[PDB]
Amino acid sequence: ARVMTRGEGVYLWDSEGNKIIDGMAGLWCVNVGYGRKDFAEAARRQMEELPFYNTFFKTTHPAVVELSSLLAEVTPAGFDRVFYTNSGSESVDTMIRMVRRYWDVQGKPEKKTLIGRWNGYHGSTIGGASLGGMKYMHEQGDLPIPGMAHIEQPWWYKHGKDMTPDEFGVVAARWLEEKILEIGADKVAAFVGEPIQGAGGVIVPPATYWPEIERICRKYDVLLVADEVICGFGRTGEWFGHQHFGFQPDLFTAAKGLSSGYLPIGAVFVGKRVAEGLIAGGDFNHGFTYSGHPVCAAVAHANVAALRDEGIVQRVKDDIGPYMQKRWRETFSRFEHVDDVRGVGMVQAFTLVKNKAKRELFPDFGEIGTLCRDIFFRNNLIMRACGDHIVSAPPLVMTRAEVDEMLAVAERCLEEFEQTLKARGLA
Amino acid sequence: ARVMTRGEGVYLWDSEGNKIIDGMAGLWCVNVGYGRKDFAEAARRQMEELPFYNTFFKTTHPAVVELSSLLAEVTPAGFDRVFYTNSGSESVDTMIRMVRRYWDVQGKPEKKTLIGRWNGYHGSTIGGASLGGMKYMHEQGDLPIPGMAHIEQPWWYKHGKDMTPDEFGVVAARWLEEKILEIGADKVAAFVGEPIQGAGGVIVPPATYWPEIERICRKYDVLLVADEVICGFGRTGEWFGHQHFGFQPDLFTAAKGLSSGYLPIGAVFVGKRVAEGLIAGGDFNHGFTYSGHPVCAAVAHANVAALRDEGIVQRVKDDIGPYMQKRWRETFSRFEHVDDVRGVGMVQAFTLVKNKAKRELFPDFGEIGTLCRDIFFRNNLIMRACGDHIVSAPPLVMTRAEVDEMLAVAERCLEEFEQTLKARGLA
């Protein structure tokens, strides 16, 4: 009977008048928060004026031109080429086609294999699911399609053995070199990864990881792609997660965080090297020119402008981010069954564990996470479980009072969670 | 710089006040025509009120519920299960995954091959391009992905030899039986086809074709899938092209015709048998419940309501359709280098040919269509060239005056085109 009635800021309300804290910002994407009535006006105006632009005209729709110009002001130097899509999933599928076409154009038609990671998520298309490494997605299908390979994820809690996180980062990155050499560098087109793995559980790699991944890609002349599905548009305090981790990808993909989810959209941001190679090839020219639904572009422009002009991204970096990260660690580090408390900017997580001292996970990874999640939900807090990882990505506009409000509810729920563990003898 | 400034009804206007006739309704999809300010109000209202619906609630967004209920009132019996997407390309990719999962659930994981047609078009994803039969899309890669096969298209003008269209329909459909038997029925999941091939040049199959295709699919336990990317939402005078051709697909895919292109959207309409088979599996349940961007759904609802309530689809069947078809044939049948004048409802075409009597096509199929297309554009009429086929699919609301206006401009260009052939000695 429970229906959602409205949203404002970080809150949702139901038909019974109950306030719900959205600690996940819809699908990790409602970065400016709920209730942006100004976006509705942007959509209305664009649709009344010119919701279409026909290819009969050799020019680009002014709404799309304006969006691309704003994006160029906020994206790293050298990403003047943007190919618009309808979603993060389509962005990934397009990027796969682009990376393969680039090598064809270069006269290296064998260079077609993309390398991803286990527990990596890259959307839901046949191609994206194949690049992804989600156990259940490959489990129930014909995946992966040819020319896809996977390396283990940089999850220190599980795989670190006796290494420090920094030592482990180097070893985890070197799995890419090992895989490139196993396949043959001349068969490898790209490595693709989320700066922080989102759906996998907010797996935050060690500081040593991305620099070594980047060194390895450059050494073997393999393209480097960041999937900014979740880290894009201010989530880490930088505009894009790759900026936080300090690597410089050749292309990066974006999902509906581009519009804070208010209309469906995505994009592939294409760097100078690949853009020039594809422009010589010619078969993405239609897309580079005529991609982007004008009404969706108008909403995304309003959203990106708000992110910049209202100082929202800067505020994550300098203000609410450090506050959230400190408070997050203060709140959860004391629990007997919580470990690997982690996060940066406005994405954060922890893992529910059987025994901290032994780094021992619960068996049937996910059962305990579901149990904890159900408690959060009963208490009108949205934070999700990915296996036994608990994850949070609230709207970036969250105030310190709202941070503290959310944490107080979560803290109460964790106390309940541990009581239920003990009472069922699983502790 | 020639820029588009506005659209109304069947007309587009440029920056220099020129009135252009859109004989193609955007991407074959602007079915209610341009200037629908009421669609803008629907989008505004939905975005102000509730543009999101969170999975925290186990209910469906009211705008999506309302859209699905309306669609069920106009779609064929048995398609109560709809899975929304952002585009026709995503619909196809989703449909491929569904068809494969359905057989997985039935305990037949070997039944994975989908059969399409040469010159068939099913969107731009890796999966869709592989199912499609566009030669250039394939060799611009290492498509198709595995588990895809193709049969020849039912194009009588080229492949009919000395059969009548109806004899040829049976022959062209039996190519499917041949391919199923070659592969083995136990390895074949589905046959997929556009009721009329759109991008392939409005190839209209003989009346005998679809019933034979259906007989074959049912005999060999192969699913039958209609791609309604272009035939959908009133184009043939029926709601869907499969209804015109009198076949019952097990699933069918839709593109942004669902919203007349005003916002990006698509859908997979899933028949009772496949829906029941998937609901047992459980892994499209999230999509079946939570698919559909609510703002896009509100615009699509307004569009589908207008198509029904303003009598637009019925008018194609009983009124403007017959008129267009009669006038089209009256206008083009007389020309020396025009043959196979064809169409139904508001989709129509012809083929530019070297010699009618010999059914001889121009060499380098495409050069000639382009030169005819160029004349059309110079005279501010948008009709598309697919190889040497000239195609038209105007907004369904086009009036008799506008039909005659359009054909008058087309006639002048064809009168011109043939004069230009001789002057080059290509005639």
Author numbering:
A (entry chain A), B (entry chain B): 33 to 459
What is written in the article reporting this PDB entry?
The crystal structures and inhibitor complexes of two industrially important ω-aminotransferase enzymes from Pseudomonas aeruginosa and Chromobacterium violaceum have been determined in order to understand the differences in their substrate specificity. The two enzymes share 30% sequence identity and use the same amino acceptor, pyruvate; however, the Pseudomonas enzyme shows activity towards the amino donor β-alanine, whilst the Chromobacterium enzyme does not. Both enzymes show activity towards S-α-methylbenzylamine (MBA), with the Chromobacterium enzyme having a broader substrate range. It appears that the different rigidity of the protein scaffold contributes to the substrate specificity observed for the two ω-­aminotransferases.
Attempts to crystallize C. violaceum Am:PyAT with a small excess of PLP (100 µM) resulted in the structure of the apoenzyme. C. violaceum Am:PyAT elutes with an apparent molecular mass of 100 kDa on a size-exclusion chromatography column, which corresponds to a dimer. This enzyme is found to be a dimer in the crystal, with the asymmetric unit containing one (apoenzyme and mCPP complex) or two (holoenzyme) dimers. Significant structural rearrangements accompany cofactor binding in C. violaceum (CV) Am:PyAT, as also described by Humble et al.. This includes unwinding of the α-helix (residues CV 317–322) to form a loop covering the PLP phosphate group. The N-terminus (up to residue 36), which is disordered in the apoenzyme structure, becomes ordered in the holoenzyme structure and occupies the position of the unwound helix.
